[PDB]
């Protein structure tokens, strides 16, 4: 009657060489996030050598009826916090076939903004601040002053923090809040496009951890959960809003 | 009081040398599968050295009442997910006595098709796609549009994926879809009769996963579901149907 | 809580040199087995060096009330698949005071039969098949035709099989059957009195695994189940009956 | 909760050098025991170096109101069941300050009896038989003919045996009886005052194991549970009564 | 639910060098205790290189509504029993901005008292005597004369002891009491301000252990529970009262 926990943790270096990999892309609605997996071969740490892939976009909800096929590309390579070992999560972005951004991409524009000379000569360290809430599934409300930096499912938050440490993303620090079940973590001085990458990946990791643990987070402005973006520069040195938009617009407007 | 999982997991290289082996043969209905186990002496990787063994055919149903004796042969030798250690599994095929195929064999015809000089020189690969739904025991209804890679019940599929990786199966990747609880995976470039072997072994492994967990899988097309074929060859390079037939009929017709 | 298995699964080489040893003898009805444990000093594989012991025969129910003293001899040197380590299980033979066999012994007669020059001349290897059923506490009925090699508490059976492999009993393979809950396993190569030894040890091990996992069994044919004998001789090379009677009558009559 | 067991099982030498030690003494009723803990600095096996300590005797009930102070001396150096590692237990005895034994001590008289030249030259060994019952917490009835060396909470007995084998109590075999829940165990060639020391230690370990598991023992003459003295000197070679009395009266009267 | 224990416990040296660190400060009410965390780069045992910090005083209840900033400093070097690894805890203290004491600071007074030339030459050791109670999470009453160490969740106390041993606290021994669920532990020789710091951090450790266990403690004078200090100086060498006050008032009055 065990929840298969004897499995799901097998060592792979003793049986085979193939390593699983999952492809995560932004969904059609702008906040939905969906993924499916494929095997791979001998591990490498260079995203350029990973093969491309596609999927059915109209089924997700970001591609037309006839042009469901929308290609994705590999650019970010990290570790896996739910199937340990050498398994890898890769943050792929949605594209209408032919190289042009999909209508709901908002990734190529950020790439060109942060690759523009006035920005790439600088170091747009965007320590964006993200905060959320952990309610439930059965009641969709938080468990149960002192709550700020306080005791409602702290194990979930500790698991998320340690999984983020393990994965390799740049996270800095967790913090509680007065409103029940509310926390926030800092990602520190990372590149704006990279900062959007880690924000999306960390939201996915949180969603998976909660669904494992028996709860669901609600990334909404009011469950208050929002976003604030700090800016660091070479000269200096909403809970569902797109991180690339806020990070890129600061780089575009300020520079 | 019910903790016996300390058993079922004992190391073998410290007490004895015997290694279990379970014989897997296709049942009478063509989709039902039966199996029983027997010891061995020493580890080996050559299927030709394994001894033969039989069973009572009329009890299973695919043999006559008086001719219940159904000789089986060893062809497949791969590890076991649910007993670990150094155990093996074999995908034996049903045969009438004297080397003649049983009425529900569908193994010798595909073997001779893929051993035909034209086909064997062709060396074709078949990434057969298989679709199914994991329903339940207590309700026998799917676990759970937006469901396409969107959630609950993923752990059974993760366990099955990792068990297939642990075994010798060549699997590719799970694709959650719109139908609740319904998932899917591709096999990949496997050589015909081999592709049928891995499809049957993977179906058995998933059946044991589900009966361990507490769910029941109905592979039938409409409990929709179907089967497709992939044809890659050196010249150019129903969800419950026999993999040998589809991979060989395209081998026979095209070649 | 209820976590006691940390103590149950301790190691002794880090603390002491004393090793437990459990003494098993045939009960009064001819099918019940009573036993307790006695400590020792150093491990050994020679049954002739073990100490002797005696119990209260009248309390058990196979000796006179006043002459309850029933000496027991050591026969078996095999490991314990419930406490592991260097723990051992030892056979015992009920005897009347003075070296004469107890009325319900049926062990010395088989010993002298298989020690006869004729029987030892034609080496009596005995493969014995034994059949049982899995009942339950609340119903005392099988868990839950097609059931032949199909699962009703397969974990109990896998545990028993692996424990038997660990504990030195020469078992050859389990075989699920048509009757719900009903299974059966073959013994294989075993020399007569030895065959009775492994049959009795395997029955005791199954009983203890059923009590550990919390489940009840009935080895009787109809709580139909039965047993057969095989005679592998050098010359040409009831589910609850005493193995010694069965394995020796064919040895005596044929040889 | 699934946690609290990793904490209880933390290794000691990884962080600090301090080792806990608990002080167990005979309570007011003569059968009850009381224990609280102190730290230490370095491991040692010589009882002559452990520091003295006292307590409040009026609260316990074996000291006068004004002279609640009751010094306790270090007696035994043996390990701990539930805090394994380098934790040790000491069997301290009650004493009115100034060297005068408490009326409920009954330990100094046995010391002087076994320290008398005739007895100490006799070297008397006492394999005392102790029998108890494992019923339950609340109902206080047995947990869960054939019962004599039988299936009523056997795990408790196995745990108690394996804990008693922690480099210490010279237990020499466990035993069951017809009375449900009833059990008993025997000690080896214990030297006089030791026999009482190990009997009290084993009773305390059994008490804590039962309270952890979920049962309560009831050491009463009629749960019938009693005791028997055994005498064996160099010349010749009640379930709740004080062991020191019985092991010394046979020492004093015979020698 | 069976998962998350593989989580919350991942190894860090395998993936990233970053180590989490949590900042605990005294709350506004005088007994509330709240904390947030942020990562670092490399381990160190020198409490002079860690970064600075601040938080929301008005939300917590310490600083005015407008000037809510409450600056904090690092001074403690310890470890975490709830996350293990190289994780550390620091006992920061509340200030008004600019280095001036906050109204509920009670740090500079004790620091100057113990660092006063006469006292620091004396360097008095304070074995504070702290006692508390473990009632319940839901009903806040114990789960259950003879109760004086003669149990109500002893596992919690054992866990707290071993956690305090791991965390580097100079603790010396535990004690029960007749009061239901009432315990206490001694810290023994500790240098002045370190006594108060260690009392506060041990209370925090116990608070998190009890909230993990599903049980709430009450640090109130009568659940009774108090605090008492010792004066073990080289010259002779309630449950919520501030340890610094009691340890420094005796330092100031006597010296």
Q: What is the 3-state secondary structure (H, E, C) of D11-50?
A: CCCCCCCCCCEEEEEECCCCCCEEEEEECCCCCCCCHHHC
- Residues 101-120 of chain A with CB under 8 A from chain E are none
Interface contact flag, A161 E6, Cβ < 8 Å: no
CA-based nearest residue to D164, from D93, D89, D242: D89
Which contacts of E94-99 are long-range, i.e. CB under 8 A and separated by 24 or more positions?
A: E94/E25, E94/E26, E94/E57, E94/E62, E94/E70, E95/E70, E95/E71, E96/E63, E96/E67, E96/E70, E96/E71, E97/E54, E97/E67, E97/E69, E97/E70, E97/E71, E98/E71, E99/E71
In 3D space, the residue among B106, B96, B94 whose CA is nearest the CA of residue B244 turns out to be B106
C-alpha pair distances (Å), D161 with each of B221, C11, D203: 58, 13, 12
DSSP C164: H
Q: Which residues in chain D are contacts of C214 at CB distance < 8 A? A: none
Contacts of D166 in chain C (CB under 8 A): 15-16
Distances (CA, A) of B64 to B35, B101, C148, C179, C251: 19, 13, 16, 20, 36
Angle at which helices A154-167 and A192-213 cross, to 10°: 140
The answer to whether D34 contacts E148, with C-beta atoms less than 8 Å apart, is yes
3-class SS of residue B22: strand
Using alpha carbons, list the distances in angstroms from residue A95 to A106, A107, A219, D188: 10, 10, 25, 80
- Nearest-CA neighbor of E194 among E55, E75, E54? E75
Q: Which of D3, D7, D36 sits opposite E174 (nearest CB)?
A: D36
Distance from CA of C7 to the nearest CA of D (A): 6
D38/E158 Cβ within 8 A: no
Is D45 in the C-facing interface, judged by CB distances under 8 Å?
no
Q: Which chains have 3 or more CB–CB distances shorter than 8 Å to chain A? A: B, E
C-alpha gyration radius of chain C = 19
- Estimate to the nearest angstrom the gap between the alpha carbon of A141 and the chain centroid: 24
* DSSP string covering A93-160: EEB-TTSPBPTT--SHHHHHHHTSHHHHSS--B--EEEEEEB--SSS-S----TTTT---SHHHHHHH
**Residue B15 sits at the chain C interface (C-beta within 8 Å):** yes
Experimental approach taken: cryo-EM
Declared resolution, Å: 3.5
Distance of CA C40 to the CA centre of its chain: 22
Q: Is E54 an interface residue toward A (CB < 8 Å)?
A: no
Tokens standing for residue B222: 């409409």
Sheet containing B33-38, strands listed edge to edge, beginning at the edge strand earlier in sequence: B33-38, B21-26, B88-91
Q: Which residues make Cβ contacts (< 8 Å) with residue B232, sequence separation at least 6?
A: B124, B125, B126, B127, B189
CB D54 within 8 A of CB D122: no
Cβ atoms within 10 Å, residue C123? 14
**Beta-bridge mates of residue A124:** none
D228, C16 Cβ separation under 8 angstroms: no
A34 touches chain E (CB under 8 A): no
Q: Which long-range contacts (CB under 8 A, 24 or more apart) does B133-136 make?
A: B133/B179, B133/B181, B133/B182, B133/B217, B133/B218, B133/B223, B133/B225, B134/B181, B134/B182, B134/B183, B134/B210, B134/B215, B134/B216, B134/B217, B135/B181, B135/B215, B135/B216, B135/B217, B135/B218, B135/B223, B136/B214, B136/B215, B136/B216
Encode B113-126: b = buried (16+ Cβ within 10 Å), e = exposed: bbeeeebeebebbb
Which two three-digit tokens encode residue C132? 């049982």
> Angle, nearest 10°, between helix axes B193-213 and B154-166?
130
Nearest in space to D63 (alpha carbons), one of D33, D22, D24, D104 = D104
Spatial distance between the Cα atoms of C54 and C73, rounded to a whole number of angstroms:
9
Exposed/middle/buried for residue B61 (C-beta within 10 Å: 0-12, 13-18, 19+): middle
CA dihedral E197, E200, E205, E206 (to 10 degrees): 140
Round to whole Å and give the CA distance between D18 and D41.
5
CB E175 to CB D36 under 8 A?
A: yes
Q: Which of E101, E89, E33, E36 is nearest to E61 (CA)?
A: E33
- The domain limits of chain B are 1-103, 104-255
- Using CB atoms, list chains with 3+ pairs below 8 Å to chain D: C, E
Question: What number of CA atoms fall less than 13 Å from residue E6's CA on the CB side?
Answer: 15
Compute the Cα dihedral for E57, E63, E67, E71 and give only its sign.
negative
Kindly state the tokens that stand for B211.
């009966």
Q: What is the CA radius of gyration of chain E?
A: 19
Which residues are CB-neighbours of B10 under 8 A, at least 6 positions away? C81, C162, C163, C165, C166
Using CA of residue D101, residue D102, residue D103, residue D109, what is the dihedral sign?
Answer: negative
Q: Could you tell me if B151 lies within 8 Å of chain A, comparing CB atoms?
A: yes
What pairs with residue C37 in β-bridges?
Answer: C22, D174
* B209/chain A closest Cα distance in angstroms: 8
D41 inside 8 A of chain E by CB: no
Chain B contact present for A3, CB below 8 A: yes
C–D CB contacts, 8 A cutoff, strictly below: 75
Answer for the pair D94, D106: CB distance below 8 angstroms, yes or no. no
Q: Can you tell me whether residue B4 is helix, strand or coil?
A: coil
Q: Inter-chain contact D151–C211, Cβ cutoff 8 Å?
A: yes
Longest Cα–Cα distance in chain D? 58
Please give the sequence-ordered ranges of beta strands (E in DSSP) within chain D, or none if there are none.
Answer: 21-26, 33-38, 71-72, 88-91, 94-96, 100-101, 129-136, 171-176, 182-187, 216-217, 227-228
Shortest distance, CA D38 to any CA of chain C (angstroms) = 23
Instruction: Assign 3-class secondary structure to B86-135.
Output: CCEEEECCCECCCCCECCCCCCHHHHHHHHCHHHHHHCCECCCEEEEEEC
A241 contacts: CB under 8 Å, gap ≥ 6: A227
Closest Cβ–Cβ partner in A163, A166, A178 for E59: A178
Q: Which residues of C touch B217 (CB under 8 A)?
A: none
Query: Alpha carbon of E239 to those of E169, E170, E219, E223: distances in Å?
Result: 19, 19, 5, 10
Q: CA separation (Å) from B188 to B116, B227, B235, C2?
A: 22, 14, 18, 47
Pick the residue from chain C with its C-alpha nearest to B32.
C150
3-state secondary structure of B178: coil
**Closest chain C residue to the Cα of B4, Cα to Cα:** C213
Chain E hits for D8, Cβ within 8 Å = 155, 158-159, 162
A10 touches chain B (CB under 8 A): yes
Distance from C-alpha of D103 to C-alpha of B69, rounded to nearest angstrom: 83
Identify whether the C-beta of residue C153 lies closer than 8 Å to the C-beta of residue C215: yes
Rg, C-alpha atoms of chain B = 19
Q: In angstroms, rounded to a whole number, what is the distance separating the alpha carbons of residues B81 and A61?
A: 37
Which residues in chain D have their CB less than 8 angstroms from residue E129's CB?
none
Rounded to whole angstroms, the Cα distance separating E188 from E237 reads 13
Q: Do A163 and E4 touch (CB under 8 A)?
A: no
Q: What is the dihedral of CA A29, A32, A36, A37, to 10 degrees?
A: 120
Long-range CB pairs of A235-241 (<8 Å, 24+ gap) are A235/A122, A237/A123, A237/A125, A237/A189, A239/A130, A239/A131, A239/A132, A240/A30, A240/A31
> E155 contacts in D (CB within 8 Å)?
4, 8, 212
Tokens, residue A230: 């700090």
DSSP H or E run through B36: strand B33-38
β-bridge pairing B21-26 and B88-91: parallel
Look-up: residue for tokens 């009997």? D199
Question: How many inter-chain contacts (A to B, CB under 8 Å) are there?
Answer: 78
**Nearest by Cα to A89 from A126, A37, A142:** A37
Strands (E), chain C: 20-26, 33-39, 53-56, 69-72, 78-79, 88-92, 95-96, 100-101, 125-132, 173-174, 183-186, 228-232
Q: What share of chain B is helix, strand, coil (3-state, %, to 5)?
A: 25, 15, 55
Task: Name beta bridge partners: A46.
Answer: none
Cα torsion angle, D54, D59, D63, D66, sign: positive
Note whether A141 contacts E: Cβ–Cβ < 8 A. Answer: no
Which of A3, A168, A178 is nearest residue E15 as measured by Cβ atoms? A168
Q: Is C10 on the interface with B (CB under 8 A)?
A: no
Q: What is the DSSP string of E5-21?
A: SSTT---STTT----EE
Residue C249 phi, psi dihedral angles, 5° rounding: -65, -40
* Rounded Cα gap, residues D187 and D202, in angstroms: 10
3-state class (DSSP) for residue E176: coil
Which of E55, E50, E67 shows the shortest CA–CA distance to E26? E55
Q: After which residues is chain E broken (C to N over 2.5 A)?
A: 144, 150, 223, 237
Quote the tokens at residue B128. 């057969």
* Cα distance between residue E38 and residue E48, in whole Å: 17
């Amino acid at each position: 009657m065990s929840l298969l926990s004897d499995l799901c943790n097998l060592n792979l270096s003793e049986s085979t060489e193939k390593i699983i990999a999952e492809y995560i892309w932004i969904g059609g609605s702008g906040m939905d996030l969906r993924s499916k997996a494929r095997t791979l071969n001998a591990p490498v740490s260079d995203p350029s050598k990973l093969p491309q892939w596609n999927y059915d976009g109209s089924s997700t909800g970001q591609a037309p009826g006839e042009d469901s096929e929308v290609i994705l590309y590999p650019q970010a390579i990290y570790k896996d916090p739910f199937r340990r070992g050498n398994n890898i999560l890769v943050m792929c972005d949605a594209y209408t076939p032919g190289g042009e951004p999909i209508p709901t991409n908002k990734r190529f524009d950020a790439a060109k903004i942060f690759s523009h000379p006035d920005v790439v000569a600088e170091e747009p360290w965007y320590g964006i601040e993200q905060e959320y809430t952990l309610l439930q599934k059965e009641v969709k409300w938080p468990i149960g002053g002192p709550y700020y930096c306080g005791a409602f499912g702290r194990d979930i938050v500790d698991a998320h923090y340690k999984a983020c440490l393990y994965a390799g993303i740049n996270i800095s620090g967790i913090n509680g809040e007065v409103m029940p079940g509310q926390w926030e973590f800092q990602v520190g001085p990372s590149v704006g496009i990279s900062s959007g990458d880690q924000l999306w990946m960390a939201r996915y990791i949180l969603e998976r951890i909660t669904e494992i643990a028996g709860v669901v987070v609600s990334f909404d402005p009011k469950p208050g959960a929002g976003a604030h973006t700090n800016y660091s520069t070479k000269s200096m040195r909403a809970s569902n809003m797109d991180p690339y938009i806020v990070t890129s617009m600061i780089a575009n407007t300020t520079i």
